[PDB]
Amino acid sequence: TELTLKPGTLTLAQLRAIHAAPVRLQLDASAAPAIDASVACVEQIIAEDRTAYGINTGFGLLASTRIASHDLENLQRSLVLSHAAGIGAPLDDDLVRLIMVLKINSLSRGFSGIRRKVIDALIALVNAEVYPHIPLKGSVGDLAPLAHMSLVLLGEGKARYKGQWLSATEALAVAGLEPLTLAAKEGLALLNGTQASTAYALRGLFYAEDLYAAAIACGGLSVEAVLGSRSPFDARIHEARGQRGQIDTAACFRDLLGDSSEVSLSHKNADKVQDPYSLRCQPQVMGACLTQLRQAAEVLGIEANAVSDNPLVFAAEGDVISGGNAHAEPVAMAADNLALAIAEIGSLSERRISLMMDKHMSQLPPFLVENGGVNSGFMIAQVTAAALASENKALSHPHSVDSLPTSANQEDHVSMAPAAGKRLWEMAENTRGVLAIEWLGACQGLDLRKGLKTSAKLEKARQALRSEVAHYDRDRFFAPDIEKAVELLAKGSLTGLLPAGVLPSL
Amino acid sequence: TELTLKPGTLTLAQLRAIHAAPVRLQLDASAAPAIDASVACVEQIIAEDRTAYGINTGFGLLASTRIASHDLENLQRSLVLSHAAGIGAPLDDDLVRLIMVLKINSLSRGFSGIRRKVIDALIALVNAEVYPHIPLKGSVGDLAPLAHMSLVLLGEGKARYKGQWLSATEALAVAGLEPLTLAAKEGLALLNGTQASTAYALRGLFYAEDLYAAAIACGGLSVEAVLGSRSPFDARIHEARGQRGQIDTAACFRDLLGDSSEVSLSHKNADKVQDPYSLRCQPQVMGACLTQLRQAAEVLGIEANAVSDNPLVFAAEGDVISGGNAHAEPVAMAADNLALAIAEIGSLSERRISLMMDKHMSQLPPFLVENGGVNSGFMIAQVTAAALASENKALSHPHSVDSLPTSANQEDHVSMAPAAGKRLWEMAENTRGVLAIEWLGACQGLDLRKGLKTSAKLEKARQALRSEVAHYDRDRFFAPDIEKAVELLAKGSLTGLLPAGVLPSL
Amino acid sequence: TELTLKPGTLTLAQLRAIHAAPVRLQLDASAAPAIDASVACVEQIIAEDRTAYGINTGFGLLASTRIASHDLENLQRSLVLSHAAGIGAPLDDDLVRLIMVLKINSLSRGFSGIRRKVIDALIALVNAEVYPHIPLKGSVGDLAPLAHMSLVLLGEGKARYKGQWLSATEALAVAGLEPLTLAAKEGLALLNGTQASTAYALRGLFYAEDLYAAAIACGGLSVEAVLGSRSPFDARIHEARGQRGQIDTAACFRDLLGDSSEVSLSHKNADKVQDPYSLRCQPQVMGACLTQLRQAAEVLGIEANAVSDNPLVFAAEGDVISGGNAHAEPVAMAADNLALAIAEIGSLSERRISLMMDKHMSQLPPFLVENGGVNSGFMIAQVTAAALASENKALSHPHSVDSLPTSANQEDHVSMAPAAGKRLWEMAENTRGVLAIEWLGACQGLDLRKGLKTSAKLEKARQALRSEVAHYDRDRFFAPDIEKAVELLAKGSLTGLLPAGVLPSL
Amino acid sequence: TELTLKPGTLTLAQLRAIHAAPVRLQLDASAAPAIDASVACVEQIIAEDRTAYGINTGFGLLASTRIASHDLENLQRSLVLSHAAGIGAPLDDDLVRLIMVLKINSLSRGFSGIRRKVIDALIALVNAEVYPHIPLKGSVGDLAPLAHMSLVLLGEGKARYKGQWLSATEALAVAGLEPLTLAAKEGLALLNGTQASTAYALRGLFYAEDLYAAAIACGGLSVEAVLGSRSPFDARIHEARGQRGQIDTAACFRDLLGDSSEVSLSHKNADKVQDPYSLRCQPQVMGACLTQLRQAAEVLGIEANAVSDNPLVFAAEGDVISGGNAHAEPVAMAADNLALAIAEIGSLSERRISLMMDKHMSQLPPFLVENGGVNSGFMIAQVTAAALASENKALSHPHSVDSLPTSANQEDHVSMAPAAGKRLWEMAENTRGVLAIEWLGACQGLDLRKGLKTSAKLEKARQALRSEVAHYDRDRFFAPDIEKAVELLAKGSLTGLLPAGVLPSL
């Protein structure tokens, strides 16, 4: 997988690919100039015995003292060691790779005053598929997680390779590297930034997108299973409202559903029963979710390319300036935004499941099973979906509204973006479980409409499932079916049915 | 105030003006065609003894029965009467006017099959400044509140005029109207829609905008009061991150602050103390808030013009279709989105207040007062700001993630957009109180820098306050000062200092 | 209403009476000793030129300086003036009276070193029904609200009398008082404490209790209306679980319901349809709520009698000690606890309403109305109940988990108990609206069981309502009925049906 | 470990031991009578061709049909298979053992009509340390998780033994069992109940208790490290407030702290600086938490012994009754209650950490390190604690206030107690991380008071830590120290210092 990186130009689709699979990358030749020039600007400051905070000074007491060169170099190690104070579970390699590539992208923009050779080391680690240990918690939005990553550069910490933990030195050799020594500003360049926060929210974004796509397919099947109407998806309704998300959503439903199906055609005159909101307001509810994840994607798309460390080096003017780009407030809001979409996608789906369980609603046997006097059918699966949908409401509580003061009142407001981002992964597992159950139920219900077929793309969704899970004939161990369905969705089995260009990264 | 309405074209600035003050409006002649044509389409259906749900049928049992004309007409009254089941405090006239104008705008787009003369009645009521009673609660997202409004059309309910409650009939005469009788589909046309939800969120939007504007001015004063740096607002920092909200925010700070001030110039060499995040990350935090309220404004801007009732009449094709546009999910998310902005604006401000109270941070006397051994100064005001900032965290909990099934499982998923929107008004009162206190504190602190002036626009912010509230010389009754400051902000005293074209409706 | 107060012995029932109506109180003679002795201890310190913090010292810089007597006295006024920095709506007289009586109770315990004559002034104000202005917001848990109350003692602020605002001096004369001058420690004695926090939560408690009582009656009517069973309330079921709240709750249902009714008897054999959880799990759900409000009442009962100011005077030993009793953490948790009860009482009730709307569940006409083809009946009322029930979920978010640092890091953790307590009042208005609608619906449904009577106490609940609201014959303006029902409940119309000794204050 | 079980008499301490380690149990002979008698009552019903719902009937359609014996037996398997529809991670053996023992306890009370031999099988599995697979999610409060457990009884599912998954049949043989066939009511007896919900909250309870205990020790060390006063813990202060939790908490502090220490004695005259609230209000804040966890423990203690299935068999009277004991509302509230305690314990601790980082507060070097110009010391550890404390606020959102309708509107209100309980485990990991950091910091700070010793018990807390983690001399890899400290706490290293009889289960 060759990627030739033009720093600051990653697209959301590129980001999804980095997240999904190993990468091979190289910096574009056009990146060298600005990168080498911020180093030269740093080198000049030092050569001219100029004092610059965050460049050649010590801290606090020494924040204006030109720390001797000797202590300057060891100050970088001490920063990284002391800052590597994270805790909790190890991030998986996929997420570690994204963070590494985000850091490379940002440093490579030439505002950080870090040597190209350090950047090249990180790249060597990516290319070698050597992923430094990074613990899940600690950042308030990303000193700790970025400090854990950088440990390996110095020959400290540990890293994963071929799924086994290696010592840093062992790890470095795998990548054809030897331990490095950091120079002025490099410690800060590596530790300051929003790459972990951004990475966490991006994974939430990609999950949110996979689930949107799945939900269009499952909701289409459910519509068919209970003989719902295609009228709610009429373009005229959506154009008259003017909401773009909803207009795009409805277009997706029409594409998947078509004008009619054998199923729909064989439910002749009757269209006298208006469909419940969980079917009929799918464009409106799923469109709102689509708009919401597009808003987040835009913010996160920009942040993936942001120059986020501090202080910034402006070689062109000779200036070094301390600002607040390491504050990940926009990332935090984007994540809280995504929370709303993942929850409402799951909520609308659970009510569709609920409908399907109701023989007064479904025009199907109660709980989707033949001879329910002695068979419980899907009844407890529906309960599982309610439990999962429910959990998402509390999980929806925003993290972007909380802050505690740190660094002795000097970092008196922070974003809490890492917590905001990572709760999204569990919300997505809940909504994924809900959709898997909807998937199972709608194929069961369509099954009961003996011999009848739905549309072309929805029939592919039925075959996808039925190749792993059989029709529900009579009560049997239920959980393995749900497990199966969930893995299918997690593997993107239905994503490909959605039309192109709808979702930010797809 | 003449407004000649081209239906579906209201701008956010027009919406802010309708919200802020009485309107005089007239429909543009180009609206008549489509409006008269949906009526004609309805008239044709009835003339052809065609059955159409939501047009000439009864409900449930009779949902396919062509209800006799006679019962058809009385069905409209009964719908409005039975649907007027709202409760809680009366909306104020300002908000009632916005809802009325939103309903007019939507019906006037010609998809609702309602007579121009009914639309004209609502317009007559607006023009006459006769505002029907509408209670605050009941909608799940807006049958009840729109049904209360429509009562007056029929000569039921009551309405406010010159701030006094009048009977509907008295009210109607003030507007030069007599009670009307509704025709086929008119009841539904009036009661279905998202106008109240939209109106509630729009007020939240306009509040959020006023507060943003105030916060740029107050944060600029606070920066000056504690001798902060202008370096964090350097354009190069914000362009390097790429976030638009933050880029625009920083531009606002530079405009208000300028390159230097007498204050800043007289704090010679020293710039050795990095400013805390509550000053230095203002572009990043306030920019995130700006982006967030721009996302909401876009959704709400579109929704203000939406065709939101049901079923929709498509005269051009002869079709009538039932869809889900009355589902206000996008409005609900937009409001939850705005919640995040109002809270973080207040949180960042309270920490700026906090900083100002700390003589190790502020370079000012503790609690902003001379001889604090016996004077408490601003100490308890700061506590008030903490209480107000705090309340906003719980208030931030999203409403868009909750739903309960209604109408016997037929409306099985709803938005909860009215609750989402109205909590914003109280969040805004909290953040307004916080900013008022920041305002007071920064003018006090600048005062203590004897004779020194800040920038041109920030000096106007100081004079604005000082014309109502005097320097704090020694302990005195504090609450009246805060009261004063709050009313000043609520009157938009600082809004005008912000550069043009930054905020969606300004 | 004579109350002769033995300080520290108020009961919850006494507290409900103070809250509900004017009081006439006098201190018991046995209170004089300890009250006069803490003053004497303060007087001795001063007479012996001993330095005591919070007694005869100034603040911060002067926290160890024996401030001259002269400045000592003016320091008390300045504390009260500067601390009166609250904001928002005026508390109503009922709540102001409770706070005043709570302060009197606490000071009268003799640990505060305040003169009996100051205490007597507050008592004079209560007895005269002169209620100082106190604004709703500002405390983080209660300097501001207690400082506003004390203003009037000094002839500052304003007070309400016979529902009109009076100047403090006018107010004082009504009570036969002249402005006072405060002595050493008195300022702190008055301003420190948890009385407002406690008062806010107590009102929440009493509301929660009224609603519990109402819900037993309404749920009993609903059970009857849909021909539910009395079997779920069998004592054996509740004893076998062992939960006390549930055991007591079920006993209440049995008392109100009885072994059988004309209604229940006339629904002969059939008991083949198990009742839904919203009826059948009433003991379990309402019992949990009962336990929860009993836990809160215990904490609040104790806190109503707490010695809560600081520093405390221990005359017996001669010691003065600074502690943290003014921290209202337990009050904050008690309120968050009560939030759960008010929400679940309303949630269970709304589902009972929902059931009643469902002719497949209710054994009643859909939406409780004859000829629903053209009549909507209770359909939109149910929607109102869903909107109100829904709002309570977000409102349930705990305030006790938030804190911001105040007083320049010296009050670095606070309770947020006032916010916790006051949100309960609105939660209670929501649940009250829900129950009013249940009340209306169950009497309507029982009505439809022509001529049949329920039990003795539930028939009184029916007559209570029917004296204000008529049977629903056909569609009519709905909101006035709900308004009526709500006022009935707010007046305690159903409270008296509940057996004695169940609820903490009743 | 022999336990001879008297059903319904488990104590909280017994429950903590079952949770912590393997058990060996036997039913007391006095349990046989009522257990054999409910079976006989079931047998009599069947022998008399009496129809009883949930005993010898089929479901829904057949809810009044005496299902043939043959289908009766297979209905039990089908219930268990179809109900085993849970998902998510496998519970660990510890938690599976607790659930099994809770189920045994409840069935053994003789109200369930299940054969002693089935109960004996579960006991055989416990004794053999064979733990059936149970997935984490699915219950709405516990059909799915109890159905997964019961699978193994029938020779389905899988179970863990010596940490390896075994087939059910392999598992059964390890316990000396063969697959069973279930009889009338047994399926329901096994699947209905609140044992998983209760088990989840109990683990939360025990965690909350361990953390309370740790926090008293760490807060005592922090007090000493920054030369705080013992005056806030004076019994007179706590008795004067009257709050029991706080009185008990303060007694704990006095026990651990003592009247004085070498440390405290060597900080001679000065006691002129009042301690911040994070030290001084420890009795008030930790006491509130203690009260809160005592309230939960009481509910959970009772529920551990509850008869929770349905319908219940009352052999004494011959009656079988369907009720709602399987509704775990009280468990859900107890868990939400515990959430508040775990969060506030962590919040108060993080502010104590914060204080310790502030040389204007701590009387220690900034960030607890010598030569901080080039050493960052504990600065980023503090950030980690803020991130962890912060996460707990959103996690605090109550689950007991949410519900969705299941079983086609027949279970229209549910508790969401499993979600409520399990979020507590992660909240406890956050607060544990916070305390570990406090622990580290206070031992570091005391270290800096060269040669000085604190009290007897607090010196043991110092030695406990120092045996794993060395004094912080200069910057080094920080995270391993925190990891170490966390494992120490998780192992109960400080629990034993707390006085006996304070905590419900200890």
- Among D61, D137, D375, whose Cβ lies nearest the Cβ of A372? D61
List C-alpha distances in Å: D45 to D49, D311, D318. Answer: 6, 14, 9
Question: Please, are residues B327 and B141 in contact by the beta-carbon 8 Å criterion?
Answer: yes
Work out the number of other CB atoms within 10 angstroms of the CB of residue B293: 29
How near does any CA of chain A get to the CA of B100, in Å?
Answer: 18
Q: Is D90 helix (H, G, I), strand (E, B) or coil?
A: strand
Chain D (20-39) residues lying within 8 Å, Cβ to Cβ, of chain C: none
List C-alpha distances in Å: B178 to B83, B148, B172, D141. Answer: 22, 18, 6, 58
Tell me which of C285, C308, C354, C427 to substitute to probe the interface with D (most D C-beta atoms closer than 10 Å): C285
Q: Is D246 helix (H, G, I), strand (E, B) or coil?
A: helix
Is residue C116 exposed (0-12), middle (13-18) or buried (19+ Cβ within 10 Å)? middle
- Among A139, A372, A394, whose Cβ lies nearest the Cβ of D397? A394
Residues after which chain C has a gap (C–N > 2.5 Å): 141
The angle subtended at Cα A354 by Cα C347 and Cα B142, nearest 5°, is 55
- Cβ of C397 and A393 within 8 Å? no
Question: Please, are residues A357 and A367 in contact by the beta-carbon 8 Å criterion?
Answer: yes
Kindly state whether D370 is in contact with chain A, defined as any CB-CB distance less than 8 angstroms. Answer: no
Displacement of CA D70 from its chain's centroid (Å) = 42
- Cβ of A82 and D478 within 8 Å? yes
Contacts of C65 (CB under 8 A, 6+ apart): B373, C51, C57, C58
Question: Please, are residues C465 and C440 in contact by the beta-carbon 8 Å criterion?
Answer: yes
Tell me which of D64, D197, D249, D325 to substitute to probe the interface with C (most C C-beta atoms closer than 10 Å): D325
Q: Which chains lie within 8 Å of chain B at 3 or more CB pairs, if any?
A: A, C, D
How near does any CA of chain D get to the CA of A357, in Å?
Answer: 6
How near does any CA of chain B get to the CA of C83, in Å?
Answer: 6
Contacts of C383 (CB under 8 A, 6+ apart): B85, B138, B139, B140, B143, B144, B406, B407, B411
The matching CATH number, chosen from 1.10.10.10, 1.10.275.10, 1.10.760.10, 1.20.58.220, for D1-193 is 1.10.275.10
Residue type, C207: Y
- C53 as an active site residue: the answer is yes
Cα separation of the two ends of chain D: 18
Q: What is the DSSP string of D5-46?
A: E-TT---HHHHHHHHHS--EEEE-GGGHHHHHHHHHHHHHHH
> By C-alpha distance, which of A207, A167, A142, A138 is closest to A506?
A207
Kindly state whether B361 is in contact with chain A, defined as any CB-CB distance less than 8 angstroms. Answer: yes
Q: Which two tokens stand for residue B120?
A: 């004209």
> Using CA atoms, how far apart are residues C356 and B175, in angstroms rounded to an integer?
42
> By C-alpha distance, which of D502, D339, D283 is closest to C333?
D339
> By C-alpha distance, which of A190, A139, A82 is closest to D480?
A82
Kindly state whether B277 is in contact with chain A, defined as any CB-CB distance less than 8 angstroms. Answer: yes
How near does any CA of chain B get to the CA of C482, in Å?
Answer: 8
How near does any CA of chain A get to the CA of D252, in Å?
Answer: 29
- Among A360, A393, A405, whose Cβ lies nearest the Cβ of C405? A405
Q: Which string of b and e fits D104-128 if b means at least 16 CB within 10 Å?
A: bbbbbbbbbbbbbebbebbbebbbb
Kindly state whether A269 is in contact with chain C, defined as any CB-CB distance less than 8 angstroms. Answer: no
* B194-505 homologous superfamily: Fumarase/aspartase (Central domain) (1.20.200.10)
B125, containing H or E segment: helix B116-128
Chain C residues with CB inside 8 Å of A360's CB?
Answer: 360
Q: CA C288, C289, C292, C294: dihedral to nearest 10 degrees? A: -110
Name the β-bridge partners of D135. D90
> Using CA atoms, how far apart are residues D366 and D370, in angstroms rounded to an integer?
8
> By C-alpha distance, which of A168, D359, D419, A393 is closest to B400?
A393
Work out the number of other CB atoms within 10 angstroms of the CB of residue D62: 16
Question: Please, are residues A363 and A227 in contact by the beta-carbon 8 Å criterion?
Answer: yes
> By C-alpha distance, which of A112, A142, A4 is closest to B240?
A112
- Cβ of A393 and C393 within 8 Å? yes
Chain B (191-250) residues lying within 8 Å, Cβ to Cβ, of chain A: 231-232, 234, 236-237, 240-246
Closest chain C CA to residue A401: C402
What method did the depositors use to determine the structure? Answer: X-ray
Kindly state whether A465 is in contact with chain B, defined as any CB-CB distance less than 8 angstroms. Answer: no
Work out the number of other CB atoms within 10 angstroms of the CB of residue C48: 7
Question: Please, are residues D99 and D149 in contact by the beta-carbon 8 Å criterion?
Answer: yes
Q: CA A161, A162, A165, A168: dihedral to nearest 10 degrees? A: -20
Question: Please, are residues B119 and B108 in contact by the beta-carbon 8 Å criterion?
Answer: yes
Task: Indicate the DSSP class of residue C232.
Answer: G
- Cβ of C78 and B144 within 8 Å? no
Name the β-bridge partners of B24. B2
Kindly state whether D285 is in contact with chain C, defined as any CB-CB distance less than 8 angstroms. Answer: yes
Chain D (336-355) residues lying within 8 Å, Cβ to Cβ, of chain A: 350, 354
Chain B (427-446) residues lying within 8 Å, Cβ to Cβ, of chain C: 429, 433
Kindly state whether A405 is in contact with chain C, defined as any CB-CB distance less than 8 angstroms. Answer: yes
Kindly state whether D273 is in contact with chain A, defined as any CB-CB distance less than 8 angstroms. Answer: no
Q: Is A481 helix (H, G, I), strand (E, B) or coil?
A: helix
Kindly state whether D283 is in contact with chain C, defined as any CB-CB distance less than 8 angstroms. Answer: yes
User: Torsion-angle region of residue B328: left (phi > 0), alpha (psi -120 to 50) or beta?
Assistant: alpha
How near does any CA of chain D get to the CA of C412, in Å?
Answer: 6
> By C-alpha distance, which of C315, C442, C289 is closest to C368?
C442
**B230 phi/psi in degrees, rounded to 5:** -95, -10
> By C-alpha distance, which of A132, D276, A138, D287 is closest to C328?
D287
Place of tokens 């800040």: B454
- Among D308, D361, D402, whose Cβ lies nearest the Cβ of C409? D361
Question: Please, are residues A455 and A435 in contact by the beta-carbon 8 Å criterion?
Answer: no
Task: Indicate the DSSP class of residue D92.
Answer: P
Chain A residues with CB inside 8 Å of D404's CB?
Answer: 350, 354, 386, 389-390
Contacts of A8 (CB under 8 A, 6+ apart): A105, A108, A109, A305, A307, B242
Contacts of D269 (CB under 8 A, 6+ apart): none
Question: Please, are residues C199 and C436 in contact by the beta-carbon 8 Å criterion?
Answer: no
Question: Please, are residues D163 and D190 in contact by the beta-carbon 8 Å criterion?
Answer: no
Chain A (103-132) residues lying within 8 Å, Cβ to Cβ, of chain C: none
How near does any CA of chain D get to the CA of B402, in Å?
Answer: 9
Q: Which two tokens stand for residue B340?
A: 């995040």
Q: Which two tokens stand for residue C46?
A: 């001063």
Question: Please, are residues A132 and A149 in contact by the beta-carbon 8 Å criterion?
Answer: yes
Long-range contacts of A227-231 (CB under 8 A, 24+ apart): A227/A263, A227/A264, A227/A267, A227/A363, A228/A275, A228/A279, A228/A280, A229/A271, A229/A275, A229/A279, A229/A280, A230/A254, A230/A257, A230/A259, A230/A260, A230/A264, A231/A271, A231/B321, A231/B322, A231/B323
Chain C (409-428) residues lying within 8 Å, Cβ to Cβ, of chain B: 409, 411, 414, 416, 418-419, 423
- Cβ of A272 and B64 within 8 Å? yes
> By C-alpha distance, which of C150, C144, C142, C148 is closest to C179?
C150
Displacement of CA B107 from its chain's centroid (Å) = 22
A93-107 helix and A12-20 helix, angle to the nearest 10 degrees: 140
Kindly state whether D359 is in contact with chain C, defined as any CB-CB distance less than 8 angstroms. Answer: no
Q: Which string of b and e fits A261-299 if b means at least 16 CB within 10 Å?
A: bebbeebeeeeebbbbbbbbbbbbbbbbbbbbbbbbbbb
Displacement of CA A206 from its chain's centroid (Å) = 4
Task: Indicate the DSSP class of residue D137.
Answer: E
Q: Are strands A135-137 and A131-132 parallel, antiparallel or unpaired?
A: unpaired
SS3 assignment for B322-340 = CCCCCCCHHHHHHHHHHHH
How near does any CA of chain A get to the CA of D400, in Å?
Answer: 10
A158, containing H or E segment: strand A158-161
> Using CA atoms, how far apart are residues A428 and A345, in angstroms rounded to an integer?
10
Resolution in units of Å? 2.0
Q: Which two tokens stand for residue A223?
A: 């519509």
> Using CA atoms, how far apart are residues A137 and A141, in angstroms rounded to an integer?
11
Tell me which of D73, D191, D384 to substitute to probe the interface with A (most A C-beta atoms closer than 10 Å): D384
> By C-alpha distance, which of C35, C38, C303, C327 is closest to D242?
C303
Q: Which string of b and e fits A409-440 if b means at least 16 CB within 10 Å?
A: bbbbbbbbbbbbbbbbebbbbbbbbbbbbbbb
Closest chain B CA to residue C366: B408
> By C-alpha distance, which of B452, B445, B439, B450 is closest to B264?
B452
> By C-alpha distance, which of A373, A375, A358 is closest to A222?
A358
In chain B, domain spans: 1-193, 194-505
Closest chain C CA to residue A361: C360
Kindly state whether D396 is in contact with chain C, defined as any CB-CB distance less than 8 angstroms. Answer: yes
Question: Please, are residues A105 and A305 in contact by the beta-carbon 8 Å criterion?
Answer: yes
Name the β-bridge partners of B131. B160
List C-alpha distances in Å: D390 to A145, A400, A414, B467, C492. Answer: 17, 10, 11, 41, 42
> Using CA atoms, how far apart are residues A63 and A55, in angstroms rounded to an integer?
10
B321, containing H or E segment: strand B319-321
- Cβ of B307 and A400 within 8 Å? no
